[PDB]
Homo-oligomer: A and B are copies of this chain.
């Protein structure tokens, strides 16, 4: 094991691990995944019920006791040709599992978390990981970054984030600084921070890596880094008077959830060979007092910046950037422990690759950001992001269709309840996505192999999720 040397015969507990958070995060992961996974054994039972004799009450009762809810009668009308509506019941029960999980974990830290970004020199934190379900837990698990109005997470196949869209967000955010002074006034020396996250598997590099880059780790890193550079060039060249941003590249080993963070130089440039590997930091501080362990991490970040040769930079990163990076590394130590303590090593064989329960498209769920729960593609149209959609369907062809299960798809968007007509335009959008995915995969749709749930939610964190009909 690359972080916990003594495994399997002795388990590591890191002195910087937040134990209560790891408990809460574990309860959340098991409970949520259970809600989805228990649908499958339930369907097997339904499938064995004899056709031809009434079994409505029998099915409704089993649903109540197995899933904790009833089913609508019209899904319990067998069709004379194909029998039980297993596809329809799967889609319904899966939508209910999502409702229950988001209601249960719906959510002070708010202002303290933005205060921390501000102090590090950032007025926004915009993060783009790969769409792969094993980065779905990126914010609450891998990085332990609290949800705030200025923390974005927009996932794309291969981390290939939308440059024009990100430019538009930069513009909106900067205008708000000028007009309202939120989260700070425009005279303050802060920058918009864009983070890209690439991933790899250390136990199965050539098969379990980023498939968008052919499981070539070098190509995945370089694509993510090139996208960051291209976004910086857009902001700098599209706007006069020294417009700029900060960039950060993070790599994730999906086997252990450990990060490696690429350290910028004093000019904000990144290098593929200049980084702190948290697996080595974990091992180097495992036997230290908490305060000493923090000093080592602070020193490891600085040491990365004194590098010459291949890793040579123009000086050290700003103090705020180095503080920010130290906190990510510190948080991530808890996550390395999380996996170690739950699995006695790396994630088990059934959780090393893709094991997503649904595809999420749109703005994503704040409430259920859990590893391998969902493949998440941020998009406003299928037309502009067709590849991200095609990659999720490919993944779900192996996961679900290979075993006769439909692909469940959650379409979800945020709106502004203070803006007249915002809710309606968002609903119209949600319904365009639905029709556009149906038209793109029309034979899958004809077989009832695509099961959709549309929803909308006010932009404030903690707002109720509002389900909307497909028409």
Partner-B contacts on A (CB < 8 A): 163-164, 168, 171-172, 174-175, 178-180, 186, 230, 233-234, 237-241, 243, 381-384, 416, 418-422, 425, 432, 436
Contacts and interface: CB of A to CB of B under 8 A. Distances in A.
Given A175-B175, A178-B178, A383-B382, A237 B420 contact: yes
A243 B172 CA distance: 14
Contacts of A174: 175, 179
Contacts of A239: 179-180
A315 to B, nearest CB: 25
A237 B383 contact: no
Nearest to A419: B237
A274 to B, nearest CB: 24
Contacts of A419: 233-234, 237-238
17 contacts: A163-B421, A163-B425, A164-B425, A171-B172, A175-B175, A175-B178, A179-B240, A237-B419, A238-B416, A238-B418, A238-B419, A381-B381, A381-B384, A382-B383, A383-B383, A383-B432, A384-B432
Contacts of A168: 168, 172
Contact of A180 (B171, B241, B422): B241
Given A178-B186, A384-B432, 10 more contacts: A168-B168, A168-B172, A178-B178, A178-B179, A179-B239, A234-B419, A234-B422, A237-B420, A382-B383, A383-B436
Nearest to A428: B384
Contacts of A172: 168, 171
Contacts of A421: 163, 230, 233-234
Nearest to A180: B240
Label chain A's interface by main secondary structure: helix
A420 B233 contact: yes
Nearest to A435: B383
Contacts of A241: 179-180
Contacts of A382: 383
A230 B425 CA distance: 11
A443 to B, nearest CB: 15
Contacts of A180: 239-241
Contacts of A233: 419-421
A440 to B, nearest CB: 9
Q: Sorted from nearest, which 9 A-B pairs have the closest CB atoms?
A: A383-B383, A178-B178, A233-B420, A175-B175, A381-B383, A237-B419, A180-B240, A381-B381, A237-B418
A131 B168 CA distance: 26
A321 to B, nearest CB: 24
Contacts of A178: 175, 178-179, 186
Contacts of A436: 383
A238 B164 CA distance: 21
Contacts of A422: 234
Nearest to A177: B178
A373 to B, nearest CB: 28
A395 B158 CA distance: 42
Given A175-B174, A186-B178, A230 B420 contact: yes
A311 to B, nearest CB: 25
A381 B436 CA distance: 12
A183 to B, nearest CB: 13
A240 B163 CA distance: 27
Nearest to A241: B179
A168 B170 CA distance: 12
A163 B416 CA distance: 14
A171 B172 CA distance: 6
A464 B393 CA distance: 42
A418 B382 CA distance: 29
A143 to B, nearest CB: 28
A183 B238 CA distance: 16
